[PDB]
RNA sequence: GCUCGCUUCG
């Protein structure tokens, strides 16, 4: 209930898709549009607010040939887990290394 | 205050609120927001049908 | 002392507004009172509300000041020659001289549907008309271009480039722009007035 | 105890009342390099038409003021030249005109233009959108006239005026004026006798 | 009336730093230079000491007691 | 002149039909001269932000 | 040439005299022809790291390389709003004889941070206002203002007259709720920072309440934050387009931060360089000396970011951080259940 | 070949009217074969030029030299053998407006076509015969490439 | 039988300012309900109520009858009272931070990369149309780097998806047209839009306000209807604030200080009227002055010191104007007409 | 509850 999905009309195209995302913002929103810009099958990504008030947003993929446009959705999201797990470890041991070298 | 002016060419009636506005760009200009507490008081009849 | 003389302007601007608000609001009513009265009947007479008779068409012609879309005139000949040149560019047909562009407006005037038009609109078109065509033929003078359609530089005829198709798409638009552009019957146009003089 | 929503009037202590529009969240926020986010974003537009130097002036002067630890006076016909406040500015190293580099809060990529940062001080005003709103049921009617009362605290409803009346009739809207002036605000039954009359 | 807890911009703890900025101002510190030690670099929490107005003893003073 | 602020120091015994207060006010820090004067900062009405 | 200005365009954000330019990310594959933009998992991981140059207690700074502008601003707001923490909710009454109202003094107590560790606890269902040993804390606030028996004959002022006039925080005390004593020291559950200021009493009043304290994130209110400032800024470069040596180059240490432009005499003549571009917080001062516009280029890096967090003293910044990227991996998870349960 | 128009421009002037924009100029360059103008918006952030500066500037239909005007959706990201690989500054536009000299009353033979390039103005006046295959409410690319 | 219904969304009502001057000060819109407490509205709609949204109480009104709310709906309908009938000019039209914003956007400067373009584009993909495709215009410049011009992105607004059938056109000059480039003007101040795309000029008050004829809203309204106006003020009104906020746009002190070449100048100006000014006071005390005609000496010697002062004034703002650089707040807030002017820029 | 006066609001 918090992912849906909706085709870009009554046809069921799955060039053209839009993922309403409820209980998020702006941060997941840019980060999900940063990790799946960078797909070269993907002709369009843009998230948008519905209205402060409510807290949902909606994104929009438009893909180059016939790609359903949920794969890149997956595969953006894999790259942004990847990412936070990457700068996770990378974190915690540049912290474990300054402790060692401070004492 | 005369009958004329004040009861039969100008009249107050109900069903009518008064409240402050605030700017919204992301409503349609043929729409207006209302608040639930006002909504709750205008009341519309609606009959019955099929 | 400039600070003293800014603020003697401001008050001066200040009682002005005062006064102007009360003063047309005592003239709004009264004009208001006075023409609300007035209505546009079906057979195209301004009538109040006695029966009497205040104009036998309004404004003369019987167009809608809200929908007058020129400087008090009804349709901008130019602005809609050139919308229906841009919206409709036929590229598979010849462009027309003036002699055809007369004839093929002579020859779509005189239908049926043309002859509930006011006299006057039609007459504005036939002029419009006619200085489009000397416009065109005043370009095909000064570029040598020919009218059999053969000549060698054919980026010459996108000068001035009329097609039979763009007449009539003109035409039509015009003649349904000035239909729906008149006075609807039953509108309070004494009240519009009023408030429209009033503001 | 009251908190400002939507609806309640500020005032900015130089005739520039205005009403909170929007409430946005602290990460939406523009910040800036040392990570301040704004209180009260107010719109540039309302200067150039009433030509209110005098605020930003005072907000050059509150900013300076609040770097060096002073209060700056706004006397009339005088007080602190800009020039003291850009030099207290650039001695703290900001900038000598207020503007500072501001990342956007929504993007986090960096505004094209300076954002014009500063302390000044609103006033709130008693006018609150609680104490205004107003919704009118059928409720009580008046004992002469059978129609609602005026007031808020009298539990009145609003008045369809001469000019409210003069809009409908031009509209032409026959059938909601008698809804509005006859059904809705003192509709009756008598009994007419046609003899008499 | 009191100081406040939190930081109205930013969101730092200022309500803790209060009596002691009172003590600095019992000492020979300046304002500027006391609010440098109470480790308050941005000029928020500077403001918020400095235009801070202390209405609590005035109040108290109209209390029951 | 509608202002909402601090009244007094007595404010808290004083019951009227209607009063309005300030939970942090704050003085000004571009204050006039006037303000110092009328002792206003003692009673601040607003708050800078 | 034109190489040159791609790079700068792609790799540099330059602060003009009037207003930023090259603000926008753009290193997007199909942006630019010579260069393939494209996601690579090796390269990222190649060229990012991350570098702490500062940590004490309730404080970090540390400088990211590599990542770009929107996952910089999304660590940013989860850290701001998204990252849970314990505060004062509910506020319990008995005889509030105050000058301070009620309300004011609920929402002061509310600010009051809390030492707890947030991961320890749970959500509160909706409702269950008597809340359970797993998801609340009490905190018991009793103070009595009494005159004190023993001062001398004026005592102005009042802290010989009254004792306990001034509730600090200190005066709360943590009661242990099922076996919440067992599982937690004593010590642990404490207030923050110990002398916030609370109220101030008089002799006669008196202060009691509880307060239950549960989990919450920031986004539902600023009382959950557990930063106090944590922002990221572009590192700055500062170069010269052509040597600047004599008096003027004075200047230039009088016209950027103190700390990063220093004058050096290599042949006896003052000769001015870039030491230390971090100090350096784009005062825009270069601007107003004319001679010396042209002869430097501000600059900040594009994929170099210094982040500062300073916290409330909840917990220390680097778990601050670490759980904000565990709380955006928890939303990707989230994400990708229901992704595969609509597949 | 889809080339419409081919020739050699040398620069004459940079900014007539001074600098209005940060990012565009309008360059004013005279052709060497032909007594061809150009008044052309250019972007010099991108794509730097100067006074003296002489560079070729191709009108194309399309950008495939294979004859190809299939130009249904451009995709930045195929990667083929294209004109484009042959200049350095491509932009694409359409030729919003073909007008006639008004300045010589007989005996005109020149014209002008006006191509907006996303805003961005480009006035080629001149021979007629070399205008040959400019028509309105065409998209074409525009290949300019800087010369020693 | 007869249920007494909650005001929902969809409903017809009735939404007026107290003090009315003409008919628009009262329309019928379409209800939707917010979790706040206040009345909330497109501000395109605010030039009708004449509201300023400085502590405006407006009132609503809910009818009871179904025949009374279908005569609100189509007579007193927002999409159909677009223009006034005093006139025919349009009312309902782009407001101030709509103006400039749009005259930002559409500015020759404006290059975005595919990721800004897309986003500004997908501002606007709420409500109905969340079913319509983007059809992102292909870019301009392509070979160094692929960037979409302000105007291709403002001309998205117009036609948004491929089976729209918007086709605008319009041409006309904007405000700092100089007079003679005739869509080659060297400010770019000359507005041509060819089937739904903005190919030359900038928009701005003369265009996007609702000052008069030749707006492109009108020109929508004229052509295709009242919906597609209405789409197109909407996808306006949710495209332009993102574009400014994402910008930015803000006014210092340091944008209305005067330069040191401007103060040299209003000196000169200054001695130069101060000394006529005497000149003429000597020549009416001691001697005989040139009277006016129609007029006394005193009312001659009134009319040439207000001469010399209009000319100081004329003169000094002019200085300013010149001297003065461009992405100034105020000038370009002049420039697109949607607040102030250059007389407010010469006083301040 | 009627009336009147003051006061504000746009
Ligand atoms: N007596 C009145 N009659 C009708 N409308 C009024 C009256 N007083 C205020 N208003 C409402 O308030 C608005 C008046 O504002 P306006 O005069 O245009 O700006 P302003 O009050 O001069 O603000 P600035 O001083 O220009 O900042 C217009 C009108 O709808
Ligand atoms: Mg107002
Ligand atoms: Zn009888
Ligand atoms: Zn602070």
Redesign the interface.
């Known amino acids: 209930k918090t992912a849906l999905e909706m085709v870009q009309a009554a046809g069921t195209d799955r060039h053209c898709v839009t993922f309403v995302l409820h209980e998020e913002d702006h941060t997941l929103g840019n980060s999900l549009r940063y990790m799946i810009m960078k797909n070269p099958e993907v002709e369009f990504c843009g998230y948008t607010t519905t209205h402060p008030s409510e807290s949902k947003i909606n994104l929009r993929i438009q893909t180059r040939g016939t790609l359903p446009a949920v794969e890149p959705f997956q595969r953006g999201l894999n790259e942004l887990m990847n990412v936070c797990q990457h700068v996770l470890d990378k974190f915690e041991a540049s912290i474990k290394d300054y402790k060692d070298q401070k004492a | 205050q005369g009958r004329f002016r004040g009861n039969l060419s100008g009249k107050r009636v109900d069903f009518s609120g008064r409240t402050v506005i605030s700017p919204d760009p992301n409503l349609r200009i043929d729409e207006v927001a209302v608040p639930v507490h006002v909504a709750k008081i205008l009341t519309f009849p609606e009959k019955v049908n099929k | 002392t400039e600070?003293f003389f800014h603020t003697m302007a401001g008050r001066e601007g200040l009682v002005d507004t005062a006064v102007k608000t009360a003063e047309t609001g005592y003239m709004?009513?009264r004009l208001?009172k006075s023409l609300?009265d007035l209505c546009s009947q079906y057979d195209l007479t301004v009538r109040s509300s006695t029966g009497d008779i205040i104009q036998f068409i309004y404004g003369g012609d019987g167009l809608?000041?809200?929908?007058?879309?020129?400087?008090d005139e009804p349709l901008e000949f130019k602005?809609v020659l050139?919308?229906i040149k841009?919206?409709f560019?036929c590229?598979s047909e010849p462009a027309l001289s003036k002699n055809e562009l007369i004839l093929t407006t002579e020859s779509i005037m005189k239908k049926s549907e043309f002859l509930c038009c006011q006299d006057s609109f039609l007459q504005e078109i036939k002029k419009f008309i006619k200085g489009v065509s000397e416009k065109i033929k005043k370009?095909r003078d000064?570029?040598?271009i020919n009218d059999n359609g053969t000549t060698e530089?054919?980026?010459?005829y996108?000068?001035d480039?009329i097609t039979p198709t763009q007449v009539e798409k003109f035409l039509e638009t015009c003649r349904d722009?000035y239909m729906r552009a008149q006075m609807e019957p039953?509108?309070?146009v004494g009240?519009?007035c009023?408030?429209?003089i009033?503001? | 105890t009251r908190r400002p929503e939507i609806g309640d009037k500020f005032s900015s202590r130089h005739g520039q009342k205005g009403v909170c529009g929007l409430i946005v969240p602290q990460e939406d926020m523009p910040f800036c390099d040392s990570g301040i986010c704004p209180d009260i974003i107010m719109n540039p537009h309302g200067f150039p038409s009433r030509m209110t130097v005098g605020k930003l002036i005072e907000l050059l002067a509150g900013k300076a003021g609040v770097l060096d630890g002073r209060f700056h006076y706004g006397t009339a016909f005088g007080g602190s030249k800009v020039k003291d406040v850009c030099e207290d500015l650039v001695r703290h190293g900001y900038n000598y005109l207020g503007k500072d580099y501001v990342t956007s809060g929504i993007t986090g990529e960096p505004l094209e233009a300076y954002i014009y940062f500063g302390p000044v001080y609103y006033q709130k005003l008693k006018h609150m959108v609680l104490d205004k709103m107003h919704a009118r049921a059928r409720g009580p009617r008046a004992v002469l006239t059978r129609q609602p009362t005026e007031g808020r605290s009298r539990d009145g409803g609003l008045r369809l005026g001469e000019m409210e009346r003069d809009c409908l009739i031009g509209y032409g809207a026959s059938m909601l004026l008698l809804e509005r002036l006859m059904i809705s605000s003192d509709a009756f039954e008598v009994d007419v006798c046609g003899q008499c009359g | 009336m009191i100081i406040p807890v939190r930081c109205f911009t930013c969101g730092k703890i200022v309500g803790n730093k209060w009596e002691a900025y009172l003590g600095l101002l019992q000492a020979e510190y300046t304002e500027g230079d006391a609010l440098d030690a109470l480790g308050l670099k941005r000029y928020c929490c500077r403001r918020m000491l400095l235009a801070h107005v202390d209405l609590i003893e005035k109040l108290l003073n109209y209390a029951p007691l | 002149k509608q202002a909402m602020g601090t009244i007094g120091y007595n404010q808290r015994n004083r019951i009227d039909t209607l009063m309005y207060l300030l939970a942090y006010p704050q003085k000004p820090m571009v204050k006039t001269k006037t303000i110092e004067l009328i002792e206003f900062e003692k009673l601040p009405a607003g708050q800078n932000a | 040439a034109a190489s040159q200005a791609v790079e700068e365009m792609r790799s540099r954000v330059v602060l003009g005299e009037f207003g930023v330019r090259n603000v926008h990310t753009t290193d997007f594959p199909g942006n630019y022809s010579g260069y393939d933009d494209a996601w690579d998992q090796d390269r990222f991981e190649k060229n990012f790291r991350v570098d702490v140059v500062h940590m004490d207690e309730n404080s970090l700074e540390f400088d990211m390389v590599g990542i770009d502008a929107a996952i910089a601003n999304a660590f940013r707001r989860i850290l701001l709003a998204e990252v849970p923490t314990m505060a004062v909710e509910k506020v319990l009454v008995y005889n509030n004889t105050s000058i301070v109202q009620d309300e004011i003094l609920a929402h002061r107590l509310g600010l009051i941070p809390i030492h707890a560790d947030p991961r320890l606890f749970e959500y509160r269902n909706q409702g269950d206002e008597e809340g359970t040993e797993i998801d609340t804390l009490q905190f018991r606030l009793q103070v009595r203002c009494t005159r004190n028996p023993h001062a001398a004959k004026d005592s102005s002022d009042p802290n010989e007259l009254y004792v306990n006039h001034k509730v600090y925080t200190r005066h709360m005390t943590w009661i242990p709720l099922g076996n919440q004593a067992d599982l937690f020291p004593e010590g642990t559950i404490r207030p923050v920072h110990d002398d916030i200021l609370i109220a101030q009493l008089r002799p006669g009043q008196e202060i009691d309440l509880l307060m239950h304290c549960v989990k919450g994130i920031g986004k539902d209110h600023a009382k959950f934050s557990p930063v106090a400032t944590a922002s990221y800024r572009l590192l700055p470069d500062i170069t010269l387009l052509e040597p600047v040596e004599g008096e003027a180059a004075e200047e230039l240490s009088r016209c950027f931060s103190p700390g990063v432009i220093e004058v050096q005499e290599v042949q006896g003549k003052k000769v001015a360089r870039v030491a230390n571009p971090r100090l350096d917080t784009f005062s825009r001062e270069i601007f107003r000396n004319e001679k010396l516009k042209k002869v430097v280029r501000l600059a900040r890096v594009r994929d170099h970011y210094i982040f500062s967090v300073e916290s409330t003293g909840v917990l220390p910044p680097d778990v601050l951080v670490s759980e904000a990227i565990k709380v955006l991996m928890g939303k990707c998870r989230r994400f990708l259940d229901e992704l595969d349960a609509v597949q | 070949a889809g080339i419409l128009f081919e020739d050699i421009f040398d620069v004459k002037d940079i900014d007539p009217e001074g600098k209005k924009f940060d990012r565009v100029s309008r360059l004013h360059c005279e052709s060497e074969s032909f007594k061809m103008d150009l008044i052309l918006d250019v972007n010099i952030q991108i794509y730097p030029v100067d006074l003296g500066d002489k560079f070729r500037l191709v009108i194309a239909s399309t950008l495939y030299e294979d004859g190809t005007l299939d130009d249904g959706e451009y995709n930045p990201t195929d990667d083929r053998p294209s004109r484009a690989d042959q200049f350095e500054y491509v932009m694409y536009g359409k030729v919003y407006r073909i007008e006639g000299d008004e300045t010589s009353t007989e005996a005109a033979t020149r014209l002008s076509a006006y191509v907006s390039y996303g805003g961005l103005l480009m006035r080629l006046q001149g021979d007629a015969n070399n205008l040959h295959g400019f028509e309105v409410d065409s998209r074409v690319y525009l290949l300019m490439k800087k010369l020693a | 039988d007869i249920v007494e219904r909650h005001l929902i969304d969809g409903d017809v009502v009735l939404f007026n300012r107290q003090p009315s001057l003409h008919k628009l000060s009262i329309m019928a819109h379409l209800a939707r309900v917010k979790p706040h407490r206040t009345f909330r509205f497109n501000e395109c709609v605010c030039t009708p109520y004449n509201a300023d949204f400085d502590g405006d109480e407006m009132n609503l009104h809910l009818p009871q009858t179904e025949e009374a709310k279908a005569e609100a709906l189509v007579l007193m309908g927002t999409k159909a009272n677009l223009v006034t009938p005093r006139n025919g000019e349009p009312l309902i039209a782009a407001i101030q931070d709509f103006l400039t914003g749009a005259y930002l956007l559409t500015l020759k400067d404006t290059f975005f990369d595919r990721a800004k373009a897309c986003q500004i584009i997908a501002s606007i993909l709420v409500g109905k149309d969340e079913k319509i495709k983007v059809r992102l215009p292909p870019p301009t410049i392509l070979k160094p780097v692929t960037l979409w011009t302000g105007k291709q992105i403002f001309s998205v607004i117009l036609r948004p998806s491929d089976d729209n059938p918007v086709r605008a056109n319009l041409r006309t000059k904007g405000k700092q047209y100089c007079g003679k480039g005739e869509d080659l003007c060297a400010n770019d101040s000359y507005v041509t839009i060819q089937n739904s795309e903005l190919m030359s000029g900038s928009m701005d008050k003369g265009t996007l306000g609702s000052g008069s004829k030749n707006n492109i809203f009108y020109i929508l309204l004229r052509d295709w209807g009242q919906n597609e106006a209405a789409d197109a003020m909407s996808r306006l009104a949710r495209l332009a604030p993102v574009y400014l906020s994402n910008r930015g746009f803000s006014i210092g002190i340091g944008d209305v200080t005067p330069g040191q070449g401007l103060l040299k100048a209003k000196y000169e100006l200054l001695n130069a009227g101060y000394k006529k000014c005497d000149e003429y006071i000597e020549a009416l005390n001691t001697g005989k002055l040139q009277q006016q005609p129609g007029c006394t000496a005193e009312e001659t010697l009134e009319a040439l010191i207000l001469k010399e002062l209009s000319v100081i004034r004329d003169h000094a703002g002019s200085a300013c104007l010149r001297e003065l650089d461009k992405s100034n707040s105020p000038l370009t807030m002049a420039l697109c007409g949607s607040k102030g002017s250059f007389i407010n820029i010469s006083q301040m």
């Open positions: 600070f709004q009513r208001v609300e809608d000041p809200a929908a007058m879309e020129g400087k602005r050139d919308n841009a919206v560019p590229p370009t000064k570029y040598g530089p054919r980026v010459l996108q000068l480039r722009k039953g509108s309070a009240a519009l009023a408030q429209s009033g503001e």
